[PDB]
Design a protein around this ligand. Sequence first.
Ligand SMILES: [Ca+2]
Length: 353
Amino acid sequence: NDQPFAWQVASLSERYQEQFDIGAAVEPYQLEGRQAQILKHHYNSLVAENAMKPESLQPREGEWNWEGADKIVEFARKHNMELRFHTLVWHSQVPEWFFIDEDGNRMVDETDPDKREANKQLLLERMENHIKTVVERYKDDVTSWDVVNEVIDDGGGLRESEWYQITGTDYIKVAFETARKYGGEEAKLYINDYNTEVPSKRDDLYNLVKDLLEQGVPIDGVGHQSHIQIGWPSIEDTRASFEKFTSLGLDNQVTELDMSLYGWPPTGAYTSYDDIPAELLQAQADRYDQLFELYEELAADISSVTFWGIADNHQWLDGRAREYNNGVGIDAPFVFDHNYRVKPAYWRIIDLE
Ligand SMILES: [Ca+2]
């Protein structure tokens, strides 16, 4: 017999009901058919893969695009699901209008110090109003806010995005302050990043959050994107990362979990699914077994575990595979395959501890 479909097997969220919520990143067109069936049965938390990015919501000043985001919000509400917000501030694909001064010129080019100070206040003003408008619309349904995303540099220190070039660290402080102001004391505010398991980047995130917390900035938790691989990162470095942020009184959430079949870069990717050798899917299952064993071990310190997709037929790792294999290649990062059939990894995370 073939592996059963995802809608034919025991629920993931139910299995982790006493541990932490189980979430999925979705697009609005996934809220129908088999994917909607899978979400209802297996997940109790949602995040928008793309519909609530800054570029999606306010592509130009005062021009709001709520409809895709509102769908996702309604779906969460009417199925009693938690809802993460991705994301309030992010260097990736930020609408260019944010960093254009009053005359139409680029703030990053400005050389006069007094004018650079004016541009900083203008940008912080635009950021505050973006946050205030979105938080005021969605605070009733959002249960975790990714306030800023990917502000640490892989090379060490802070990422020198336009946000940092123009405002220093002030965009981060003002972002959390504004989300707290309009979200209320009950809003849960997160800083999200990837490779939080790499000790040097972990330590830079820790020292940023520690300094900001000492200055009264309201940060409730750390989001660990957890874009991981079969062989990397180690269970030990993941454990050490969660422990370090818990020691500051912060919550931990796994926010964008997916496990590539390949290393970094994903060279040698398979071209079709049926070419993936069984041994490799089983290596993925063994890795997921260990990872979710660690999550349950640390469950008191993790509120939510979200996968960056539902099933292997829609995910961003395919594009990365093609990038490094001359425009051909697929990946298979989830516990439900491209046909929605359970994978070995599903069986290794549904079973009892
Ligand atoms: Ca297991």
